[PDB]
Structure formats: C-alpha cells, structure tokens
Amino acid sequence: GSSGSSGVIGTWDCDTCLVQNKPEAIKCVACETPKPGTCVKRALTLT
Ligand SMILES: [Zn+2]
C-alpha cells in the first residue's frame, strides 16, 4: 500500500540474473534462484 508497494504485476523481475520469469514458476530459469518472500501475501484478504 504505502511506503513502497510490491509489483502488482504478473511476471517478476529477478535480482541475481535480472531475468523476466512467469508468475507461475516458483524459481528462476536462468540462474535458477528461489523466489523471495517465504510467506504468501495472498494470506491477507483481497480488496
Ligand atoms: Zn534469475
């Protein structure tokens, strides 16, 4: 919400290789790095 919002888009931009990966892939394809954020935001109630 405020103080920095999380990309509300689908695909996520990697940090190591900085490659474009689908929101379905749990990990990257180039560097094969595990997506950050252990907890799933979904947990909370949608708008
Ligand atoms: Zn990567």
* DSSP one-letter string for 4-46: S----SSSEE-SSS--EE-SS-SB-SSS-PBPS-SS-GGGSPP
**DSSP one-letter code for 43:** G
Q: Which residues are documented as binding site?
A: 14, 17, 28, 31
Three-state DSSP state, 27: strand
This structure was determined by NMR
CATH code of 1-47, in short, is 4.10.1060.10
Centroid of ligand 1 to alpha carbon of 1 (angstroms): 26
CA 11 to chain centre: 7
Three-state DSSP state, 39: coil
Centroid of ligand 1 to alpha carbon of 43 (angstroms): 25
Centroid of ligand 1 to alpha carbon of 30 (angstroms): 5
45 residue type, one letter: T
Centroid of ligand 1 to alpha carbon of 47 (angstroms): 30
Listed as own residue / partner, the contacts of 40-44 with beta carbons closer than 8 Å and 24 or more positions apart are 41/6
